RNA sequence: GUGAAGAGUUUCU
């Protein structure tokens, strides 16, 4: 159907069609609020594959996030420590800008659950994302076995605990030798806990 | 137990055995084994020669299972077999010769130390030394290689 | 000092294990590859904040280096190295 | 397949048998519907600017320059060689 | 981003 065509065309971000549409939409986005409601997904095919459905209780929000690194917020570049910690400028936040987009939209919609998010645009100053949210109080959500899980209280603010797709990526959650540091603190605890058995 | 400890004997002896001149201060030559090249050199060079420096190649991601190969000598080969098998073949004349599968006894290579009795035996092993194979063949036995 | 550009010496090379004529030259250090593991390690260590991470020699003296003679067997292409005492002046032939 | 632990065909000799088809290994095949969709999309979307630059170098017979540019644009040489072959087919498709 | 001259299939003022 149309979804395959939208998926393939979305891969062509340098084509004349997508370059033009990106320019006009980025201009339009910069004219409205940093966080604003989207009436519909700008990328319906991308939204579906990330869990979105066109039913009551699913909500799309758009947000722009400042690009670039994290300047150390210390008074006059003064760090009061050893030279290894004197850096102020070329530093980087450990969470993705997409994660920040989810965090801020989740605070903005504190009655909703953040499901997922996707990139839509960027200029030199901002990256634009659309965040998919679900109303756990809506009956259409609570009676739906495919999205029911998110009502349970263990899924409260899953974006704040790195439990969305981008949150687990930023946490380095993965299988095998490349992710041995694993959940870091839990792995660290296992290796730094002295185990003293009853030798009898 | 504390009752038999030297601490109990030093009650009333002011310096607790650590001297009046030199005392029992906090770390007076540094912590741990720091200083092996400078003020501890006369100890390191006398009791731990070879400590400082690098020797040989690195090997990234060593996995020891493909290297597994415990060894058994010829003088232990007949001890790997049950007592009933020894009595049946060892020293007798039989049409069949016993099979000693060294791998199921936990060995990957048969080495040549010691001697064998003069009875035929079939030694099943992944590896065998040259001298071990010669002595097995002199006893009338054979080596058959396995995986 | 004055050292002849040619000398007849024992050749340790496997094909000429005898006295042969050699061409004499002074040894000079090679030009410091960027791919050597120690340089790769040092460069990785020096990146980021923390400043200078390893000692650096700020002085220099004892400019009398031991003279190292490179002896090339004329025909065999075999090269040998010979060490002499320190000196301020060197001249081949 | 000597049945030893050393040599070319080492290892214990068992009765070999044909493993069944794993459909996950079909990935990477080109379905006829997907090829049709991509041809339509290539019609609607054009070529990326670097793709046009690479094709121009191909059309001027600057084969090394095209390889250097495609590798520089895409990262690896392996992706470059695949891209240059694809753009070469496009160029000859128009001829 | 969009257009015009000039320079020994191109991008520089
Ligand atoms: Mg989970
Ligand atoms: Mg005292
Ligand atoms: Mg004193
Ligand atoms: Zn020689």
Swiss-Prot record, chain A:
Q: Which InterPro entries match?
A: Rbsml_eL15_core_dom_sf (IPR024794), Ribosomal_eL15 (IPR000439), Ribosomal_eL15_CS (IPR020925), Ribosomal_uL23/eL15/eS24_sf (IPR012678)
Q: Where are the transmembrane segments?
A: none
**Main location class:** cytoplasm
One GO MF term, please?
RNA binding
Report the residues modified as Phosphoserine.
182
Gene Ontology biological process:
cytoplasmic translation
**Keywords assigned by UniProt, alphabetized:** Cytoplasm, Nucleus, Phosphoprotein, Ribonucleoprotein, Ribosomal protein
Q: Locate the compositionally biased regions of type Basic residues.
A: 168-178
Kindly state one GO CC term assigned in the UniProt record. Answer: cytosolic large ribosomal subunit
Family per similarity comment: Belongs to the eukaryotic ribosomal protein eL15 family.
Anything further noted?
A: There are 2 genes for eL15 in S.pombe.
Relate the protein's function as given in its record: Component of the ribosome, a large ribonucleoprotein complex responsible for the synthesis of proteins in the cell. The small ribosomal subunit (SSU) binds messenger RNAs (mRNAs) and translates the encoded message by selecting cognate aminoacyl-transfer RNA (tRNA) molecules. The large subunit (LSU) contains the ribosomal catalytic site termed the peptidyl transferase center (PTC), which catalyzes the formation of peptide bonds, thereby polymerizing the amino acids delivered by tRNAs into a polypeptide chain.
| Name of the protein | Large ribosomal subunit protein eL15B
This chain's source organism reads Schizosaccharomyces pombe (strain 972 / ATCC 24843) (Fission yeast)
Curated annotation (Swiss-Prot), chain B:
Listed InterPro entries: Ribosomal_uL15, Ribosomal_uL15/eL18, Ribosomal_uL15/eL18_sf, Ribosomal_uL15_CS
Endpoints of the signal sequence? none
Subunit structure of this chain's protein? Component of the large ribosomal subunit (LSU). Mature yeast ribosomes consist of a small (40S) and a large (60S) subunit. The 40S small subunit contains 1 molecule of ribosomal RNA (18S rRNA) and at least 33 different proteins. The large 60S subunit contains 3 rRNA molecules (25S, 5.8S and 5S rRNA) and at least 46 different proteins.
Question: Hey, which family's this protein in?
Answer: Belongs to the universal ribosomal protein uL15 family.
**Region of interest called Disordered, as start-end residue ranges on this chain:** 1-37
Per the record's keyword annotation, is Transcription included, yes or no?
A: no
From which source organism is this entry?
Answer: Schizosaccharomyces pombe (strain 972 / ATCC 24843)
Where do Basic residues bias regions lie? 1-12, 20-30
Tell me the protein's name.
Large ribosomal subunit protein uL15B
Q: Where found?
A: Cytoplasm; Nucleus; Nucleus, Nucleolus
- Please, what other remarks does the record include? There are 2 genes for uL15 in S.pombe.
Tell me the SUPFAM superfamilies matching this sequence: Ribosomal proteins L15p and L18e
GO BP term, pick one:
cytoplasmic translation
A Pfam family (short name) is Ribosomal_L27A
Question: Which branch of life, at top level?
Answer: Eukaryota
Annotated Gene3D superfamilies: 3.100.10.10
- Which keywords does this chain's UniProt record carry? Cytoplasm, Nucleus, Phosphoprotein, Ribonucleoprotein, Ribosomal protein
Gene encoding this chain?
rpl2801
Q: Name one GO cellular component term.
A: preribosome
| GO molecular function per UniProt | structural constituent of ribosome
Q: Which residues carry this modification: Phosphotyrosine?
A: 107
Query: PANTHER family given for it?
Result: 60S RIBOSOMAL PROTEIN L27A, LARGE RIBOSOMAL SUBUNIT PROTEIN UL15
Curated annotation (Swiss-Prot), chain C:
Please name one Pfam family that this protein belongs to.
Answer: Ribosomal_L44
**How would you summarize the oligomeric state and partners of this protein?**
Component of the large ribosomal subunit (LSU). Mature yeast ribosomes consist of a small (40S) and a large (60S) subunit. The 40S small subunit contains 1 molecule of ribosomal RNA (18S rRNA) and at least 33 different proteins. The large 60S subunit contains 3 rRNA molecules (25S, 5.8S and 5S rRNA) and at least 46 different proteins.
Q: Which family does it belong to?
A: Belongs to the eukaryotic ribosomal protein eL42 family.
Q: Which GO terms describe its biological process?
A: cytoplasmic translation
Quick one: where's region Disordered?
24-54
Work out whether the entry's keyword set contains Cytoplasm.
Answer: yes
Query: Which InterPro entries has this protein been placed in?
Result: Ribosomal_eL44, Ribosomal_LSU_eL42, Ribosomal_zn-bd
Q: Which gene encodes it?
A: rpl42
Q: What is its main location?
A: cytoplasm
Q: Which residues carry this modification: N6-methyllysine?
A: 54
Q: Which PROSITE patterns match?
A: RIBOSOMAL_L44E
Instruction: Please give the Gene3D superfamilies that the UniProt record associates with this protein.
Output: 3.10.450.80
Which protein, by its recorded name, is this?
A: Large ribosomal subunit protein eL42
Which Gene Ontology cellular component annotation is one that this UniProt entry carries? cytosolic large ribosomal subunit
Q: Keywords, A to Z?
A: Cytoplasm, Methylation, Ribonucleoprotein, Ribosomal protein
Functional description taken from the UniProt entry: Component of the ribosome, a large ribonucleoprotein complex responsible for the synthesis of proteins in the cell. The small ribosomal subunit (SSU) binds messenger RNAs (mRNAs) and translates the encoded message by selecting cognate aminoacyl-transfer RNA (tRNA) molecules. The large subunit (LSU) contains the ribosomal catalytic site termed the peptidyl transferase center (PTC), which catalyzes the formation of peptide bonds, thereby polymerizing the amino acids delivered by tRNAs into a polypeptide chain.
Q: Give compartment(s).
A: Cytoplasm
List the GO molecular function terms: structural constituent of ribosome
| Keyword Transport (UniProt) | no
Query: Which residues are in coiled coils?
Result: none
Curated annotation (Swiss-Prot), chain D:
Q: Which family does it belong to?
A: Belongs to the eukaryotic ribosomal protein eL36 family.
* Xref: InterPro entries: Ribosomal_eL36, Ribosomal_eL36_sf
> Which organism is this entry from?
Schizosaccharomyces pombe (strain 972 / ATCC 24843)
> Could you tell me the gene encoding this protein?
rpl3602
Q: How does it assemble?
A: Component of the large ribosomal subunit (LSU). Mature yeast ribosomes consist of a small (40S) and a large (60S) subunit. The 40S small subunit contains 1 molecule of ribosomal RNA (18S rRNA) and at least 33 different proteins. The large 60S subunit contains 3 rRNA molecules (25S, 5.8S and 5S rRNA) and at least 46 different proteins.
Q: Where is this region: Disordered?
A: 1-31
Tell me yes or no: is Ribosomal protein among this UniProt entry's keywords.
yes
Q: State the remark under miscellaneous.
A: There are 2 genes for eL36 in S.pombe.
Database matches in Pfam families: Ribosomal_L36e
Main role? Component of the ribosome, a large ribonucleoprotein complex responsible for the synthesis of proteins in the cell. The small ribosomal subunit (SSU) binds messenger RNAs (mRNAs) and translates the encoded message by selecting cognate aminoacyl-transfer RNA (tRNA) molecules. The large subunit (LSU) contains the ribosomal catalytic site termed the peptidyl transferase center (PTC), which catalyzes the formation of peptide bonds, thereby polymerizing the amino acids delivered by tRNAs into a polypeptide chain.
UniProt xrefs under PROSITE patterns: RIBOSOMAL_L36E
* A Gene Ontology term for the protein's cellular component: preribosome
Q: Which UniProt keywords apply?
A: Cytoplasm, Ribonucleoprotein, Ribosomal protein
Gene Ontology BP, a term: cytoplasmic translation
Write down what this protein is called: Large ribosomal subunit protein eL36B
Q: Which Gene3D superfamilies match?
A: 60S ribosomal protein L36 (1.10.10.1760)
State the compartments where it is located. Cytoplasm
Q: Name residues in a coiled coil.
A: none
């Amino acid at each position: 159907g149309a979804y395959k065509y939208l998926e393939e065309l979305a891969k062509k971000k340098q084509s004349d069609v997508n370059l033009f549409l990106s320019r006009v939409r980025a201009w339009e986005y910069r004219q409205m609020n940093v966080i604003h409601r989207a009436s519909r997904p700008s990328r319906p095919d991308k939204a579906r594959r990330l869990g979105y459905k066109a039913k009551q209780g699913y909500v799309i929000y758009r947000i722009r996030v400042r690009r670039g690194g994290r300047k150390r917020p210390v008074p006059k570049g003064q760090t009061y420590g050893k030279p290894v910690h004197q850096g102020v400028n070329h530093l980087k936040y450990q969470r993705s800008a997409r994660c920040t987009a989810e965090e801020r939209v989740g605070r903005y919609c504190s009655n909703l659950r953040v499901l997922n998010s996707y990139w839509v645009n960027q200029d030199a100053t901002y990256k634009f994302f659309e965040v998919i949210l679900v109303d756990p109080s809506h009956k259409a959500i609570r009676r739906d076995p495919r999205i029911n899980w998110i009502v349970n209280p263990v899924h409260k603010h899953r974006e704040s605990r790195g439990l969305t797709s981008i949150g687990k990526k930023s946490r380095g959650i993965g299988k095998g030798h490349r992710y041995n540091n694993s959940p870091q603190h839990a792995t660290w605890l296992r290796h730094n806990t002295l185990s003293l058995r009853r030798y009898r | 137990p504390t009752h038999t400890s030297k601490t109990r004997k030093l009650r009333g002896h002011v310096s607790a055995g650590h001297g009046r001149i030199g005392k029992h201060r906090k770390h007076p030559g540094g912590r741990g084994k720091a200083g092996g090249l400078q003020h501890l050199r006369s100890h390191f060079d006398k009791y731990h020669p070879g400590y400082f420096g690098k020797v040989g190649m690195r090997r990234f991601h060593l996995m020891k299972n493909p290297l597994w190969r415990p060894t058994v000598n010829l003088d232990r080969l007949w001890t790997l077999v049950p007592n009933e098998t020894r009595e049946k073949y060892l020293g007798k004349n039989t049409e069949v010769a016993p099979v000693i599968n060294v791998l199921q006894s936990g060995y990957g290579k048969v080495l040549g130390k010691g001697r064998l009795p003069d009875t035929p035996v079939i030694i099943q092993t992944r590896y065998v030394s040259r001298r071990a194979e010669e002595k097995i063949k002199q006893a009338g036995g054979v080596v058959e290689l396995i995986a | 000092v004055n050292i002849p550009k040619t000398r007849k010496t024992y050749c340790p090379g496997k094909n000429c294990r005898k006295h042969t004529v050699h061409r004499v030259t002074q040894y000079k250090k090679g030009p410091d590859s960027k791919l050597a593991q120690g340089k790769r390690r040092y460069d990785r260590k020096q990146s980021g904040f923390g400043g200078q991470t390893k000692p650096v020699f700020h002085k220099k003296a004892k400019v009398t280096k031991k003279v190292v003679l490179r002896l090339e067997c004329v025909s065999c292409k075999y090269k040998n190295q010979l060490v002499l005492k320190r000196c301020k002046h060197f001249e081949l032939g | 397949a000597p049945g030893l632990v050393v040599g070319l065909n080492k290892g214990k000799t068992l009765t070999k048998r044909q493993l069944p088809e794993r459909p996950s290994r079909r990935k990477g095949h080109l379905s006829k519907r997907t090829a049709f969709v991509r041809s339509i999309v290539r019609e609607v979307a054009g070529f990326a600017p670097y793709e046009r630059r690479v094709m121009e170098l191909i059309r001027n017979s600057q084969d090394k320059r095209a390889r250097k540019l495609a590798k520089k644009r895409l990262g690896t040489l392996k992706r470059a060689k695949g891209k240059i072959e694809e753009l070469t087919s496009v160029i000859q498709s128009s001829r």
